[PDB]
Design an enzyme around this catalytic site. Structure first.
Site, PDB file in Angstrom:
ATOM      1  CB  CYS B 157       3.720  -2.972  -4.243  1.00 22.29           C
ATOM      2  SG  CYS B 157       2.183  -3.118  -3.401  1.00 22.29           S
ATOM      3  CG  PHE B 208      -4.391  -3.305  -3.255  1.00 17.77           C
ATOM      4  CD1 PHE B 208      -2.681  -2.753  -4.216  1.00 17.77           C
ATOM      5  CD2 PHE B 208      -4.694  -3.994  -2.072  1.00 17.77           C
ATOM      6  CE1 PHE B 208      -2.217  -3.303  -2.626  1.00 17.77           C
ATOM      7  CE2 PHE B 208      -3.464  -4.089  -1.171  1.00 17.77           C
ATOM      8  CZ  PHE B 208      -2.506  -3.598  -1.357  1.00 17.77           C
ATOM      9  CG  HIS B 296       4.048   1.255  -6.517  1.00 12.51           C
ATOM     10  ND1 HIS B 296       3.193   0.221  -7.650  1.00 12.51           N
ATOM     11  CD2 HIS B 296       3.951   0.855  -5.340  1.00 12.51           C
ATOM     12  CE1 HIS B 296       2.385  -0.188  -6.737  1.00 12.51           C
ATOM     13  NE2 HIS B 296       2.344  -0.055  -5.699  1.00 12.51           N
ATOM     14  CG  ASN B 329      -1.186  -0.079  -5.718  1.00  5.43           C
ATOM     15  OD1 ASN B 329      -0.909  -1.768  -6.211  1.00  5.43           O
ATOM     16  ND2 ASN B 329      -0.742  -0.420  -4.555  1.00  5.43           N
TER      17      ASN B 329
END
Lengths: 383, 384
Positions: B157, B208, B296, B329
């Site tokens: 990530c 995700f 992030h 994400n």
């Protein structure tokens, strides 16, 4: 405030390591077919035996010994599900083999581990999160601030790659010292021989385990640090007509190499342009005035490279030395060659670390049909 | 020596993005997900997943692996059945193709001939192949065959922050170098049926999504012809203390599975101050609310913890949450989407800098090893 280094990236140390258990190539076909339970395939075994006897290889090293192999019997089959156990072994052993080679490289270099600022780590065996780079950082107790470049699934040109990567890290950062690592095990590719894929017979005969570690930096400290080679240029190229020539596929059965073109040939016909672009920084000397560190992909490819360039037999001896003593260790091999080149120059008391030559080429090749080249300046020995 | 360096700091000259076409509304996803995986009878499990989705700060995600793809590859719709080979087949083909779409947009924004690209940096966490996605991307775009390529597989990530660090030195150490900086992610290696035995997958399954982003980075930008968006002045990373095995990502015959063994939201913003304080030294140590922030978008909770720890104004993490909201994400790509959203918000609002008026800012990635990656960026004056 951001300061760049002054001079070219310099190899300051070269360390190497192998698993302890040695395998004589002459006894290998016997061992191989027995442990994979395929010794009844007589004419297959005669093919492997002839590939082995013509490989230019005397000895290889394997972490996966008979005990390791019998404790993971799926690895002794051809294509039965086996990825999980190959992964378990590689994720653990790849950074530990690196540590051993690193210990030696760090010792030759002779400076505190806390002056290492960067880590570059390449491997073709196994993938994990976190990477082998981080684990290696922990094992060595490097500064938690090291800037890491992790190159997974890199391929046989990986030794040349880490030189190119480390070059810019060293040169763009004042005082940077780069721990430059390639660590390869065969546990992800090892498998029973079979008729349906005769190109695996070569891989099974040439690939061994090994790791090499360099310390690279610009602006070496006089008397304190000892330059071995200077990296003056790194570049690569994708060869023409080389689409799908080598495919490397990681499947539930591990890593399998699929070939669909003339690679020994492809390499010898098409390296002339990047070679010519590369040596220009060296003032274009002729082929026999260069020293040569070529990925020992196979004895045949080496033979073809020499004929294409009309090399004297003495040119590729350091390369063949590694092939003879260690086999094809994927990306690490050419870094072993570089170590052997300086050692040969020490034994013979040559005038440079390139056995007397001023400039040389590091050459890797692999998938995509990628050719990687760095141009190195040798260092005067004082002899 | 004879090798020629560039003179100034690595500069972002273009930012492009792409996603698969099919959008999935978060409010409708648990029905879709529990039906397609044949788990809609696990009522309290479905009730648990539903509550995670409604609290995720996520509105829409994009997926390449639609119903048709999933029903043609049924092993992926189980929990832990053998499935890697078909996930690999999908990821190996689509990852470099998704990157190409983001690249076409970055290359057009940049507006220079493709043959002036000298380097390619490519990060992905989904699938691995030889030759790499970097080479395939090079062929698709028809780049110079002599491009210097850095391929970062299984990166994690923090991959978006990584490629900034990696491209920085490529751009700065090579005069005229132009770095095509790529992160491309699919969830096809991680997608799997929900199950009681591993409730932490229920979170990944809710957050995700798929995406790719591509930058052009270079030093010494040409006046008028090229348009600087951000300057990278410092990149660094650290391994967090006591953070050994906090997040493991394992590639198996069942695809990619993550295993947590610590409190990462807590660990993260409790241990981020040393690298953060060292980072801002380059920016003259402004206070946290004077920096712009590209973090992030790991989850709504981690973002919340970062705001409380540093006492950030709610406005600071808005570009980040914009991305979490519209895209989910997308692993490594997510922070590059954010970087793009930041210059977009600044354009829309007529801000004085590409950082919504802030002079300096931080790009922050975090992930396995418990690695925190940070680059310090200088914003560019907009002329507004």
């Amino acid at each position: 405030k951001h300061r760049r280094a002054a001079g070219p990236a310099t190899v300051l140390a070269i360390g190497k390591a192998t698993p302890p258990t040695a395998y004589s190539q002459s006894e290998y076909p016997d061992f191989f077919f027995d442990i994979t339970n395929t010794s009844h395939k007589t004419e297959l075994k005669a093919k492997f035996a002839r590939i082995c006897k013509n490989s230019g290889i005397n000895t290889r090293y394997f972490h996966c010994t008979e005990d390791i192999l019998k404790a993971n019997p799926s690895m002794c089959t051809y294509l039965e599900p086996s990825l999980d156990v190959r992964q378990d072994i590689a994720i653990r052993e790849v950074p530990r083999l690196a540590e051993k080679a690193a210990i030696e490289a760090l010792a030759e270099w002779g400076q505190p581990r806390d002056q290492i600022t960067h880590v570059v780590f390449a491997t073709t065996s196994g993938v994990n999160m976190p990477g082998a780079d981080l684990t290696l950082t922990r094992l060595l107790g490097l500064n938690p601030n090291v800037k890491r470049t992790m190159l997974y699934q890199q391929g046989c040109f990986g030794g040349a790659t880490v030189l190119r990567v480390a070059k810019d890290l060293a040169e763009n950062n004042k005082g940077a010292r780069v721990l430059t690592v390639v660590s390869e095990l065969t546990c992800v590719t090892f498998r029973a021989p079979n008729e349906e894929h005769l190109d695996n017979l070569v891989g099974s005969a040439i690939f061994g385990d090994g790791a090499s570690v360099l310390v690279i930096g610009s602006d070496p400290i006089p008397e304190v640090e000892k330059p071995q080679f200077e990296i003056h240029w790194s570049g690569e190229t994708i060869l023409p007509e080389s689409d799908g020539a080598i495919e490397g596929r990681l499947t539930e059965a591990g890593l399998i190499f699929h070939l669909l073109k003339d690679v020994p040939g492809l390499i010898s016909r098409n390296t002339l342009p990047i070679f010519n672009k590369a040596i220009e920084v060296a003032g274009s000397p002729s082929w026999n005035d260069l020293f040569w560190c070529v990925h020992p992909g196979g004895r045949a490819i080496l033979d073809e490279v020499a004929k294409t360039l009309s090399l004297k037999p003495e040119k590729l001896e350091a390369t063949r030395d590694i092939l003879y003593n260690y086999g094809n260790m994927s990306g690490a091999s050419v870094l072993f060659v570089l170590d052997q080149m300086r050692r040969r120059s020490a034994e013979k008391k040559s005038r440079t670390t390139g056995e007397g030559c001023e400039w040389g080429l590091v050459v890797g090749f692999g998938p995509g049909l990628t050719v990687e080249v760095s141009v190195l300046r040798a260092i005067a020995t004082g002899h």
